[PDB]
């Protein structure tokens, strides 16, 4: 007796019956899977073997120290890069597999039961926040939301000045960026034209800034029973036909954030350690003095950006140029108006089975490259004395061997020890290479009991941009000037 109740004598479960929805509900509840393992991905996992490198650039000598780092993110927020993604609407059903991890999700588009949404809008009434969509799709949900928006803007609603939020990192690897911003980021990074090669060779430094402006978010309350999102026309076999199982379970978009997003690239050829500070000052719109080190950095900074939402169409703009246009990028989407509903920039998913928020674990190993720059310099000599003079100029040229060991190669001015006469001038180019610079200058007095007189003798001379050593005067009273020009 107990076997037959709530069942058809045919033994079949009729399509469009309450029995069908019940079977679907039990079918999803019966699923046993590991939530974390299904949403976990590993990046590269590099090994810690690195040697110190030295390289000569046209204007400077760089010392590069490579190091393996680890970046691991564990978030439920999924960044949106697609423009008009029909799949990414509130309450949409997504399949849990590789495609969900890659942010190119598989939409489960079956007959949907009505769903109730709430929207958090600054200056929106309590019970006017709810929306009842009878047949959830991208269109029906988008329409219901925009209808509420249009009403909310035309009725009243202050032009809410939207807060700007941003997170930033120093670029190193494309994989590392993907862990930080999402695995769909590769499209954006290619638009930003990030020069990873020049970073690794220490020729330039990159910082990536992600701006977010959330106008509003649409949310879905917890689903009581897994089968409550399906119409009775949906059967268990229908789900299996589309490959739904405990191994490929279901998830629903529990909320979507709407507004404007900006991925910013700050590309500087500087090797300074004040780069992060200079970039920050730029973002804050802080005035920069011309003779500062920051101004040197910012003048040599190329800026590219991808705009998602705000201003014109929904389409993504790829603006390019100098530092001057960063300020307007930030101010552009400051106000949320009737002109633009705003578009999805972020969404979150919850498992259909138990409404637990789906959290994605991503990690990767990357090489953190440090670069230390030593500027080239020139050593200038001027001989305007009434005497024969000799120079003894000597230095070491620094290099690094294939084992990263430090190497000092002795060097000497080819005209050392030679008798030089006024008016003699010369310029000796010295690379950042140079350590332990020593200059000795002596003069022939003509006196039999003391033929030579030292006019100048310094060791460990700093490699400034321009050092001019000028000698003049007489055999008995020689004069010397050690003039340094190293101002920025």
Numbering used by the authors: -17 to 470
Paper text:
Gram-positive bacteria, including the common wound-infecting Staphylococcus aureus, the virulent food-borne pathogen Listeria monocytogenes, and Streptococcus pneumoniae that causes pneumonia, utilize cholesterol-dependent cytolysins (CDCs) to attack and kill mammalian and human cells. The bacteria produce and release CDCs as water-soluble monomers that attach to cholesterol-containing cell membranes, where they assemble into large, 200–500 Å cytolytic pores. X-ray structures of pneumolysin (PLY) from S. pneumoniae show that the soluble toxin monomers are roughly rod-shaped and consist of four domains (D1-D4). Sequence comparison suggests that all CDCs have the same domain structure and therefore insert into target membranes in essentially the same way.
We also deleted Ala146 and Arg147 (PLYΔ146/147) in the loop that would clash with the last β-strand of the central β-sheet. X-ray data were collected to 2.45 and 2.5 Å resolution from crystals of PLYD168A and PLYΔ146/147. Superposition of both structures on PLYWT showed no significant overall differences, although a detailed comparison indicated small changes in domain D2, helix bundle HB2 and in two of the D4 loops. Around the mutated residue in PLYD168A differences were restricted to sidechain orientations, while the deletion of two residues in PLYΔ146/147 caused significant conformational changes in the loop connecting helix α5 to strand β7 of the central β-sheet. In PLYΔ146/147, one loop connecting D1 to D3 is also slightly different (red arrows). (A) Ala146 and Arg147 in the loop that induces refolding of the last β-strand in the central D3 β-sheet into helix α13a in the late prepore and pore complex. Deletion of both residues renders the toxin inactive. Even though the structures of PLYD168A and PLYΔ146/147 were very similar to PLYWT, they displayed major differences in their membrane-binding and oligomerization behaviour. PLYΔ146/147 was not able to bind to the membranes at all and had no detectable hemolytic activity. The pivotal role of the loop that contains residues 145–147 connecting helix α5 of D1 to β7 of β-hairpin one is underlined by mutant PLYΔ146/147 that was completely inactive and did not even bind to liposomes.
